[PDB]
Each structure stands twice: as C-alpha cells, then as structure tokens.
Design a protein around this ligand. Structure first.
Ligand code: FE2
Ligand code: FE2
Lengths: 685, 670
C-alpha cells in the first residue's frame, strides 16, 4: 500500500487536478449566503433593545457580480422571504404549522381583510420581517449589482444566432426533460406555427376567443386601405376567425389613445436617483388568427398598439395567408412580421403574468381562502374538501406582494410610468392588477362556460379542428372528472336545494366573497348544482388551472427573444417604418448586448419564471383522502357518510389515471412537429 | 374524431380501470394529514384568548391503523415538528430566517444556557405534550398482515425485507438484509470499521487480554488462549462502561418496564426490554479481515461474574461442522453486542459527539464572537438550522423513541427524566467526550491504529479511518490558509479580544473542559477543523447509512425482548427459537411497536448540504484578512476534495472481496 500520509502529501503538494471555474455554481450553501448578505449590509438593522429600526444596514447594493451568481442569489433571497412568510404566518395563527384547534369565533378575529391602501385587491391583513410598514424590495435591488461580468452570458450576443447558440449549449442530458429546456430548442421558434400555437398550448391558453363581427369589419376596412384583396376575402368569408385582444390595457390604466406605454427606469445609488435612465415600451396589441379545418392556428394580422381604432394604429398583415403558403421572403428574414410577433408576445407576457396567473389563480383564490376561514367552521364538509388545496398559499402570496410585483414585474414591464414608483397609485402595473381583478368573472371561468363564451365547441365538435388545443380538450375532461368527485362528496350531505338554502354558513360565505372579497361574480349558491360548480371551480383554480398557466413558464420565457416582457426601443412611428425593419431593428428592441442596462432585463425576464417555480398533486390528494376515510368509522360524522367520501376518492383516483392516458393522446394527436403538452399529467397537477 | 364529451362519459360510466388499493401511499397530502390530526384531536387546544391551554384536544390516541400508515404518519408529524422548531427559532431570534444585524450584547441576552434541570447537558435555553401527540399517532393495535415484523420466522422477515427493495443512491433505499449472510462473523465485525459507529473500536489493553486468557483457561479452550497469549492485533469494542454511566451495580440487570397507557393513565399492563454492557474481543488479520473471537454478554465487574462465549471459528477462513447460520448461541451473542452498539452509536457517537457538543460551541460562539469576525464567518455556515433540529430531538426523539426501545429503563414513560438511564448515558457520554482526543489524527493514534504510515494493507477494511485521515488533512489545509490570512502569529491569537473568552465559555458554561485554551495559530486551526469535521463529514459518517444498518431490525436491534440467559450453560443450549423470542418478531408482546420505532428512528434522523457546495459558494462570494486568500483557499479546498473523492472510491473497492461498500464520504455526500 501507498499509505494515507503519502496520498495526503501528494494531494496538498501537487498542482490542483480540478479547476473550480469549469464547475458552475448550481446551489448556494445557505449559511455562506446568509453570512455574505450580512457582511454586505443586506440585512435588517436593530436598536440596542433588539427591535427592528425599520432600516437596512447597507446604504448601497453590491458593486460587482456574475449573471449565474445573481440569478441564483435572487432565487435564494426569494426562498428565504417565503420561509420568513411561513414562520410569520405560523406565529400569527394565519397558517399554523403544528395543528391547533381554533373555534370559528377565534378565526373571525385572526383572519381580517386588508383595506386596499397597499394597492392590492382585498387579501389577508398581515400585521421578524413581516412586523413593519416595501423596503424588502430595496434588499433585492441591492442583490442585483451596479455592473456584472458580460462574458459567457445568455444576453451577450451580440447577434440572435449568438444567443441561440449559447441557449442550446446550456441544455442538460443526452415532461421531465421539457422543464429544463426552452422553446429555443426549436430553430424555428420564431415561426407563425410555434407563435400561434402558444395561444392554444402555451402558458396563457385560456384568453384567445372568437372575433366579433365588429372587429372582423375593422380588419376588412384596414386590408381594403392597404390593398390586400386576398386577406380581405378571407375575413369577409369569416371562417373561424379568432382574436387575442390586448386593447383593454388602455381602459385598464386610464391611458388615452394619445399616450404611449413607457417605463422610465431610474438607476438608484441606494435610494437616490443617479440621473441615468433606461426606457422600456409596452403595446395594447391585437392578433387576428384563422383556425384551419386541419387544426392549425394561423396568425393573419397584428395591430402593434390599438389606439381606439385601426385608422389611428399600425396593423401589419402576414404575407402568408395559410400555414403552408410560400413567398420569396423566408419567415426567418421577415423582420417586420417577426417584430410584430415579438410585440404581441410582450402583450401576452403582461396578460399572462398579471391576469391569467397572479389575479385569476392567486388573488381570486386568496379572497375565497380568507372568506372560507372566516365563515365555514373547520369541522364542515365544505372546509375539509377545499382547505388541502390551499396549503401555504397565503404566506407565498404575501412574499409575492412585497417583492415580485413591485421589484420584478413593475421593473421589466413597459407600462411604467417610472421604476421604482414612489406611489402604487400612479403605477400602471397595479392599475392592471386592479382592473384584471375587478373584471374577473368567477362563473364565466368555469371550464364549460369558459370554452363556450370564447366560442369553442369543444363539447361536440367531431371535425378534429381543435386537435391543436390540448389545454381545452384536457380541461373539458379534467373539469368533468373533478365535478364528478365534488358531486359524490357534496350530495352525501347536500341531498336537496333545501339543505343548501338552510345551511348556516353557505349564505354568509357567498356574501363574504362578494363584498369584502370583492368577487361579486361569485354565485349566491341556493342549489346543489351551484354548490358543486363553485367547489369544482375552487379546486380547478388551486390545482390544474394554476399548473396549466405556470408549469412551462421557464420553457416559454427563459429564452427571452421568443417571449420578452417589454420592448427596449420605441414602436415604429408608422406602417411605412415597420415595413423597412431589418434584423438590427428587432435586435435593438430585445435585451441583447452590454449597453442600455439590457443585461438586467434579460436576467429578470429569465428569473421571474424561476421565482414562480422552484407530490403537490390530485393523485396524492385522492390517495390521502381515500386513506383517512378507510381509517374512519361511520359513527364519527353524522352530516355525511365518510364511506361515500372513500368511494368518491377511489373513483377520482382511477378517473384521473384514465384521463392521464387521454391527455397523452391529445398531445400526440396534435399536427406533426407541434410542441408537447404534458402540463396536466395527473401527478403534475 | 371521438369528442371530449364521449371520452368523459366513457370514463365516468365505465367500471374503474385502476384499483387504488394496489397503489400504496408514499407521500401524505400535507393538508389532508393536518385536517385528519385535527379531526382525531391530535392538535393543541386553546382558551378563548387564542392562547395555548397546555393540553391536547384528544384524551386518547388512534384506535386502529397499518404499519405503513403509522410509519409515514410518524415521519410526517416529525417533519411538521421540525418546521415548527424553525418557526419558533425565527420568532425568538435564535436562528433568524431573514438576515438581521445583532450587536454582541443583544446576542448575550438572546443566547442563554439551559441549567440542566431538563436532564440534558448545557444547550440553548428555549424560552412535553408534543411527545403525547406522537404516542397518539401509534395506534393501540395495528393490522399485522404484510408487515416486516410479522414473521413468524427469521426466513419469513428476510423474504418480506428483500421484496420491499425498490428498482450510494441505491444503498440508501436498501439494508444489510440484502446479504443472505448478514449474520456472518465477517459482516458483523466489519460494522466496527465501516458501519454507523466506526470510531470507538480500539486496541485491547494488556489487563483486558489477561482477563480473556483466564476465562479461556476456565473453559479449556487452548487454541484461543494461545491466540490471546500471542496477542497479535487484539482489538476491543468495550461497552462495560454502561454500568458506571447509569450508577447500576454489578448485581442489577438492565431492564426497561414499558407501561401501556390509556391516554396518560397506566392500565397496569407492562412490556419488558433488556440491555447489556457487552464486550467484543476481535483479532485483525494481516490480510485486513477483522475476526470476532469472544463476546461477554453483560460485563459485571469481572469475567468470573459474567457470561463469555468464544467463537468456534478462530480465523475468518475456518469451517466447523456447525455452519455460522445454525450457530444460534454465537448469533445470539452477536445480536446482544449489536444492542450495545445501537446505544453507544445513537446516544454517544451520534447525539452527544456530533449534536450536543456542537450546540455548546454554537451557543458559546454566538455569545462571545461578534458576527463581523473571521472566526464567526468560517464556523457559522456549518451550523445552519442545527439548534432548531436539536430542540425537536430533545423534546421527542430521546424521551419518545430512544428511551422507549432501549433496554436501560428503568421505565417508559419516565416521570423523572434525571432517574431515566438513557439521560444518565447522555450525561456520562457528554462529560467523557474529549474534544482534542477526537481530532482525527489524535483519535486514530489513541485507539491504536497506525493509519498514518502502515504499508502492510491490514487496514484495507477500515475505510472510515483511511478516508478520514485524508479528509481531516484536506479540511485542516483549508482552515490553515483562511485562519493565517488574519492570524499571522501566535501574538495575534493571544491579543484577540474574543478567543480567550470563547475557550473559557466552552470549557465552563459549555462543560467541555477538553476544549483547548487557544493561545496559538496551530491550536486555532485544529479547533476550527474539529468544528467543521463534527458538523459535516463525522456526522455524515455516523448517520448516512442509519437506514441500511438498522431498518432490518434482526441485524441490529435496539434491545432484547427476553432476559439474558442465566449462565454460559443456558447460552450454549440456545436454538433458532431462543434468538427469535429475543427479537421484536411476531404479533405478541407489543413487538410490532419495537420493530416500527426501531425502523422509524433512522428515518426520523434522515428528514447539497456538502463541502463541495460550501467551497464553490465561498469561492463565488470572494470573486467579489485578504479575501483573495479566501478565494484561493476555497479553489484549493474544492480541488483537494474532488481528488480525495477518487481515493475514497479506491479505499472502498480496495476492501477484501464481498465487503459492503463505503460511499458515505463521497464529497457531494458530506
Ligand atoms: Fe403561482
Ligand atoms: Fe443527526
């Protein structure tokens, strides 16, 4: 044997065999991170008596850092803030960690309504770090250095081919797989096909709708003005013309048809503006599509920024009038049209992250959670069936309110008017949240109601023209299966409309949600059918809908050029300027290169999806419900038969597994080359 | 095309395609679990004020359940308790979640010393019924069908054990029962070198060898007497100290009388478990194979007053017309020795030597060294959320699990924690820990192992020792580079405002007088190396394969379910049925509970925590004392760790063929 002392001497005395620079950081050692935040004064300061003095120790943020180090630092500080929220929510009795018996009367005192003066729709009143009265956003701004190393970054470029090459080289390996890649895996990520497909199977699949006759007539007139006879004939024919309408952004912000969307970002030295500014731009875009009989959604027209009418706007029409159409200009080299698609993507980033995700799943659900906790006692069937879908939701939403919206979304959006905003009330991101919350319709977003209102005959169509809409096909199935389970459970106790109407809690529950919760579209439940649909909607909102709009966040956003949050240059002044656009015009509009603080925009655009990500599923739920109701004797509860709950859970489990097979078929049944849709695989939701 | 409405109608209207009973529960939906605990009154009760009234809602625990459902419920409630501890430790400022600047004077007020009236060595003063909550999750009775303890034979539990295996990564989800010859002399002895307690075996003193020479003379075993007289590499695992540790006389037996409770009230029904202050004598052969020669079941002052059995097999290669499998007296002896190692491992090697020793140093560090200091910055990352987990362990693991399945008693539950022999064993182990003697180089030398310089290959089956010599040397090198960046001479140490008080705080309030009076750079480096060793690789070494070595209970049970044999004569008559009665096998004598808790303990002690992640993190912050030196130290440490990782593999593969793997220190394991 060569003895241990010789193996030790040989390792210490020889040159290094392993170069640490060739081994990128994947995880922060949590203890080293906490020490470094403290060393850099990115920490709460205290008086001698051990209380917080409301300040941070540091006057200014980090001088210097790396892309990878900052990205990981942002995830780490967010996950720390989420841990702090859980701890505070435990301390305050909002979400106890160890189970505690609380009479309803105690819960009415614990769970209060916020008053709206924080700029948010009504949520849990939050009264350690959560003990003060928006400085937590200053701590995050300090983690983003003044400047970073631009070498071997995803934004460096300086060309699109350069960022594409870098993007591909970062993929691991040789549903699980899809998560750790992005749409840039496709060389034709920019294509009409993959652009339009996102409106059916991307992170925002539930807002595309049938174009009204009024809208089609606007686009008929605009095509007449541009002398485009072919596209005018397609619209006049009017065969399955669809719209993604983002024109409401102006109504939502109180912006006039003369005002442009601009975010003027002020560089800060601590709290003090340096005078250096960065401008980002948004657009209330409109996309017109045609759904072909073969199932392929084709984009026909994009209005960059809809300003009251098409007469007062810039509308470009696709050179290609069907999916297979050709012309002497390749899709890759059609820069005016690629610019238009990129603008429409910025619009969908806003609608997705603010409305479809934050409002429609988190803030709507929080009102219902608070209302439920205040009105329905913990012993009740209604509480037992809803509450498991709400585990640690209130604490995560508190973290999101303090950091995500003001610190990230308000920064990379192009609505402004300024970042940081001195007040919430001038800030267009907050107005968009307010408007989206006020204009959410709880019953219209019941899956069967939603699909019909948006003009999709998913129920009965046998043409196969919805084969590229797996969100809709999967959701029709999944809703029906969740409703079946809710039906079996609810009817165990609620044997007639009379039992609903005489219920001590349901009446007050609906009123609490409608008034204090400010969801007047929540039903006044007087029937078993209404009770089933409301409960189905709550479970849908909490689990599969949230999964659908969140699971592939990283896939669709992390390669920023495919779906940027905002434009880095002004819109073209008129249609003439747009038609002259080249590769350089689209590149300048994207956060590519080492100028104009664009590294920060790329970092935060790629980071947001990560912050919203990193057995929380219906199968685990079903097995768990089955298990406790196998263990229950029949005497225990008298309002419902727990053997029926056991039966419902067994049924639900099997129905979910069966549906999982169909979700696969609907994904594989898409037209050749279409991106996979594995987001609802039952042990995913 | 067949539309969605038809696929929905077809799934709802058809018989179920999937039977949920054929899909075992692996994860609790956390919300359903919390609701069910609340429904069963397994929850804290409150006054109108919203305050805790100190009681649980439920007066009695669950009536009925399954082995698998209870096991999963125990892990789930423990992980909840750990979350609650983190939340409390955040609330009280003990371990803030969000970073906060605290002046030293504030920290002296936050971090106080416990006074020992809780029965524990000195620890953090925190500011019970939480133990009653866990006892309620264990039902009064369970379903015995398709359980690992049912048996009723050893072959039956062996068959069940093997069938439950799934599919370093692999080793985790299996156990020593994967080997048909788990009971063998080879795999028994090997655990003293590469099991969960590899750091207590030692060179046998001349006095001890002379006792065993005399006992072999009494039994007329000429061959074994000649081997001992020759005295070539005779090693000892000595557990005789259990009597000194508990104040037990040589006339008293170790017994745990377990009282059946209806809520809190004894029914009068009891179950007995038995422990033994065993001694194992081994010979290390030149080829590296550790061979067990003799086991004293329970050492009671002398061998004259004890029961000592000597192996029929005098070398590893020996064959007797009685196969190892059918040598029930010897298999019984090995099983008794295993109970002794369970206690020494879980109490001393794990709980005291890594957690409680470390906690004193953490408290002392927080009270004396300000957060700005290099000493605080180098130590504190290795202590992330340790204080909260230790509090959970003090409230639940020791009184509720370890004191229940151990055979020391005198009774479970104990009204008086100071009168409980498990707590006396903790106290004794803490008082007799030698901080400087457990420096790896000091430890190997004191226990009589020439790991440093040996070229015979006789330590090829001691990968813990070989790996640790390397790893200690590498950690020390990193600590050296970092410490010397500020501590440029002994003078800078001696003039340090904090180090003097730090040492005194640990020695007095911390009750670790073996902690050095640090007046030199070399002493400072070794102390800091020891803290990092204790926090990371030593802890990993004694904890990582806990499940592998304990979860198949017959291979290493926590206690005996029957009394020891009366005398050597009785022991030599033992059969398969005698060993089986001693193990928690079958549906009688509450043995299902012992198996459940024995297999559960390792799991509860398991719920990128490594030196590679640490090194890369330190390197990265020091890309932006001379902090370029810290960057250099971290780069060096990273590379040295990777290089060592290759050697750890070689030392594992270099073991005599068929020896169990040792992947416990693979640098992204630590
Ligand atoms: Fe979310
Ligand atoms: Fe441990």
């Amino acid at each position: 044997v060569v003895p241990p002392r010789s193996k030790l001497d040989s390792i210490l005395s020889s040159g290094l065999e392993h170069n640490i620079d060739h081994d990128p950081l994947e995880v922060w050692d949590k203890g080293v991170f906490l020490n470094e935040l403290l060393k850099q004064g990115i920490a709460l300061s205290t008086n001698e008596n051990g209380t917080l003095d409301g300040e941070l120790v540091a006057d200014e943020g980090l001088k210097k850092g790396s892309y990878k180090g900052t990205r990981l630092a942002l995830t780490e500080i967010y996950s720390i803030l989420e841990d702090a929220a859980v701890s505070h929510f435990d301390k305050r009795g909002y979400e106890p960690i160890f189970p505690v018996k609380r009479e309803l009367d105690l819960k009415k005192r614990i769970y209060q309504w916020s008053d709206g003066t924080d700029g948010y729709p009504p949520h849990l009143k939050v009264d350690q770090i959560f003990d003060m009265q928006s400085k937590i956003a200053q701590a995050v701004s300090f983690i983003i250095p003044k400047d970073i190393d631009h070498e071997n970054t995803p934004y460096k470029g300086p060309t699109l081919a350069d960022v594409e090459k870098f993007n591909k080289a970062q993929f691991p390996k040789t549903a699980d797989i899809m998560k750790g890649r992005n749409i840039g895996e496709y060389d034709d990520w920019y294509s009409d096909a993959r652009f339009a497909q996102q409106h059916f199977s991307g992170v925002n699949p539930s807002t595309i709708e049938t174009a009204s006759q009024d809208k089609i007539k606007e686009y008929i007139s605009e095509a007449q003005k541009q002398g485009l006879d072919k596209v005018k004939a397609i619209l006049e024919d009017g065969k399955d013309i669809l719209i993604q309408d983002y024109s409401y952004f102006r109504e939502a912000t109180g912006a006039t048809n003369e005002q442009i969307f601009q975010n003027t970002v002020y560089e800060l030295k601590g709290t003090t503006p340096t005078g250096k500014t960065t401008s980002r731009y948004a657009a209330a875009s409109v996309v017109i599509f045609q759904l072909h009989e073969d199932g392929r959604l084709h984009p026909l027209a994009i209005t960059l920024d809809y300003k009251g009418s098409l007469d007062n706007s810039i509308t470009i029409f696709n050179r290609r009038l069907s999916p297979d159409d050709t012309c002497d200009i390749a899709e890759k080299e059609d820069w005016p049209w690629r610019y238009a698609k990129t603008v429409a993507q910025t619009a969908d980033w806003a609608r997705h992250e603010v409305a479809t995700h934050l409002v429609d799943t988190h803030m709507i659900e929080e009102a219902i959670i608070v209302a439920t906790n205040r009105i329905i006692p913990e012993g009740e069937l209604l509480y037992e069936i809803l509450s498991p879908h709400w585990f640690r939701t209130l604490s995560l939403n508190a973290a999101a309110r303090k950091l995500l919206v003001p610190g990230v979304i308000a920064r990379i959006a192009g609505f402004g008017p300024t970042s940081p905003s001195l007040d919430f009330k001038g800030n267009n991101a907050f107005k968009l949240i307010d408007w989206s919350y006020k204009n959410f319709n709880f019953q219209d977003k019941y899956i069967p109601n939603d699909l019909k209102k948006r003009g999709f005959d998913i129920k009965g169509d046998k043409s196969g023209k919805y084969k590229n809409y797996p969100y809709a096909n999967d959701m029709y199935l999944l809703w029906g299966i969740i409703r079946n389970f809710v039906k079996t459970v609810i009817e165990s106790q609620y044997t007639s409309d009379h039992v609903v109407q005489k219920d001590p809690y349901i009446g007050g529950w609906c009123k609490e949600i409608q008034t204090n919760g400010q969801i007047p579209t929540f039903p006044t439940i007087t029937t078993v059918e209404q009770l089933i649909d409301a409960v189905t909607m709550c479970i849908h909102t909490a689990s599969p809908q949230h999964t659908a709009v969140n699971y592939l966040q990283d896939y669709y956003y992390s390669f920023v050029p495919a779906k940027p949050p905002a434009l880095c240059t002004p819109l073209p002044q008129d249609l003439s300027a747009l038609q002259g656009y080249t590769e350089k015009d689209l590149t300048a509009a994207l956060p590519i290169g080492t100028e104009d603080m664009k590294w920060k925009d790329w970092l935060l655009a790629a980071q947001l999806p990560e912050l919203l990500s990193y057995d929380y599923n219906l199968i685990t739920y079903a097995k768990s419900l089955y298990n406790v109701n196998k263990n229950r004797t029949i005497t225990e509860n008298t309002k419902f038969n727990c053997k029926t709950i056991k039966k419902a859970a067994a049924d639900f489990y099997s129905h979910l597994k069966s549906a999982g097979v169909e979700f696969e078929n609907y994904s594989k049944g898409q037209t050749a080359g279409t991106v996979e849709y594995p987001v609802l695989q039952p042990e995913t939701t």
